């Protein structure tokens, strides 16, 4: 069952590469609703892992609170089969391995965290766009580090906003109430359309396949206008979404 | 006609730079590829490389690239192989065999039995 | 480049018989189409056969190109005084061509 | 030519002047666009080709023309994007050498922009084409047979067909841009990363976030930008502006006038002030007073 939790103040990302200082810029952008229901999927290890091929829709606000990267990367595609050209993400060592090819996909795709990658993409036919850089999990691997991602695709480009922060306490088992803007890491020149999103889970073996504690949240963004309060350093310290409440409109 | 007369056998004091002469005739240097090959006394020949003679561009053999200096003039139709400096070890039979990457024999020189000794 | 050695160093045999020159290549080179060289005795060598198995331009019908890969086996159906001389298997397609060990024909000392 | 090498060119900063330079590269004529304009235009998914040309037959296979080589080796539409670049491979093909067999006897004409990988022996007569080339059936490929003799007649030409895909996707291949070097503390036009503008440029003490590259104020004008060349950050201030005012005691009461430059520093204005520089602006010898 999808545990539904309020988003509180989450999912805010920098709109563009403009240094705005102490000015309350307003833009209508694909945004996560404030205090919004988001489905919570818990993966504790029988296998409690869930890998449903969720519809990508316009966008997604993915976040992982795992101490160890049980889940590495994601699978995006229109149909996620050999005919469809689907992009791959994986945090193996120091390489993202951003591959966009017609990939035949395993029914249960797992990677050996201690690989099994040739099974998860069975067919490497028709490779078009390939990029390799520093791993997207550039954050360091008492606290449990949290990695938040926003995935979008538009204008023949795939846009990812992300921000990584340590979280001290697991007792809430939900997104902490705090404001943090997801910086623009990469923009991917690929222009393949994606309608369904599948998380790429890594399970080597009993560690049939067991792994550490993990909890990943998925939320869907929609168009909305926000007052983003840039500060003197240009960081968005906080923002108010007009939609949520009658007071918010007035601001 | 395409005939190649090389330098004659010469007694040579070891340690001087000598340009051996291979005459060319009756051929277009760009149209006909020239090569360079030498035989040390009494065993199979050694490659010196192949020359693009229309440009007089000699790509020497990796064994003999820099070991010998090969030059030729398309207009004068006579090679001038500096051979770096001729040394006592350089005593060998030199054959002006035309050829390219295909390494065909084409027309060899008459033979250069240079014995580099005092 | 590829080491070329044709067995034997001297096939001592009577003239007019059929013979083969088994050139040994360290790396199998059929793409070389190696340029067999027949060293005229004490003269400027004439290319025995070019194309490995293809025949040389203006070569007699007895001289037949044969052999490919690591082993080139040039077939000569009738030995002549020209055959009674040193041979060479030399790389044609392969650059830095390597001359063979040589082969010779004789009957008496 | 029968199996010509289609190639894809991407993520390229490509200068085409070098190709024009070589004397063997005598042919770089383009059916598509002017070569001078080409050095500036940007394209994507550039197609390059590899084939061996006698030059006697290139006119038959030239775009806008069809020959038995064009009908079989490579069909090409009359309109041709990009250039046909031909340079003499006279030597490399001479000696002789017959490897590059190219298709001249095929059953049917092929479609434009198509490469025929497989060799199709000409299905000419009703009698079956069994036994490859034979009676009523002919081998497609003809040995290119370039010799020193064929070096002169049917001169060997190493020819590449360059047909750029006309930036249907975002253009990924083109030439040099952004030549001019920067100056500071001067009223100069700028095209920093293609961003046109005019102003006085100075180093910006204000920080930028690593993703942030250009700075916008409350007025949304540009006030700071990270230099494309270097991580040094430049404040951009608009060039000095102002309105002029003339003080006169009346035309009948003499003709001397006094000019007031409103809201501008006295050191900033030379007599060159550019807009309205027609006036001599008197001189520094004339009393100049800096007022609020
Ligand atoms: C992780 O898996 C990917 C493919 O699933 C591979 O990544 C390779 O990483 C090494 C260096 O880290 C490089 O050769 C390339 O970046 C990748 N090779 C490819 C994509 O063929 C590799 O199998 C794994 N990375 C490891 C073990 O470091
Ligand atoms: C915002 O940026 C400014 C400038 O970088 C920071 O202010 C100074 O930062 C340097 C090092 O980053 C320190 O050595 C100084 O002591 C800081 N001075 C002041 C007055 O802050 C500032 O820390 C950044 N953050 C905030 C919230 O202002
Ligand atoms: C999410 O919605 C369901 C009904 O659709 C509701 O029962 C649940 O309480 C909501 N989650 C919240 C309010 O956190
Ligand atoms: C498909 O799921 C089953 C479930 O046990 C298992 O065979 C495996 O996880 C998947 N198949 C492959 C080939 O991995
Ligand atoms: C396959 O790859 C080519 C080039 O890599 C690309 O143009 C094409 O869109 C891809 N997909 C299909 C279905 O051909
Ligand atoms: C899928 O993407 C291609 C380009 O990658 C585009 O041409 C096509 O229209 C898209 N299909 C849609 C949006 O249904
Ligand atoms: C002022 O100027 C007018 C015309 O320019 C002239 O007629 C008049 O006499 C002048 N008066 C004085 C006091 O200068």
Numbering used by the authors:
A (entry chain E): 25 to 69, 74 to 142, 149 to 175, 180 to 245, 254 to 297
B (entry chain H): 1 to 118
C (entry chain L): 1 to 109
D (entry chain C): 347 to 441, 444 to 621, 625 to 643
The article reads:
Omicron subvariants harbored a high number of mutations, especially in the spike (S) glycoprotein, and clustered in the receptor-binding domain (RBD) (Supplemental Discussion). Among our recently generated Omicron RBD-directed mAbs (MB.02, MB.08, PC.03),3 all have strong binding activity against Omicron BA.1, while one of these mAbs, MB.02, maintains high activity against BA.2. MB.02 mainly contacted a flexible loop region at the left shoulder region of the spike, and no overlap with the ACE2-binding interface. All six CDRs of MB.02 involve in RBD interactions.
We then determined the cryo-EM structures of MB. Fab in complex with Omicron BA.1 spike trimer at ~3.2 Å resolution. Two major S trimer conformation states were detected, one with one RBD up (72%) and the other with two RBDs up (28%), indicating that MB.02 bound to up or down conformation of RBD regardless of neighboring RBD conformation. In both conformations, the S trimer was bound with three Fabs, one per RBD, suggesting binding of MB. Fab is more flexible, especially in up conformation. MB.02 binding interface contained two key residues (K440 and S446), with K440 contacting CDRH1 and CDRH2 of MB.02, and S446 interacting with CDRL2 loop, indicating MB.02 has distinct binding epitopes to interact with spike compared with clinically authorized SARS-CoV-2 mAbs. MB.02 could bind to RBD regardless of the bound and neighboring RBD conformations. To confirm the structural result and evaluate possible antibody evasion, we performed a neutralization assay with K440A/S446A/V486A Omicron BA.1 pseudovirus. The result demonstrated that triple-alanine BA.1 mutant could result in strong resistance to CoV2-0213, indicating the above residues are key epitopes of CoV2-0213, consistent with our structural findings.
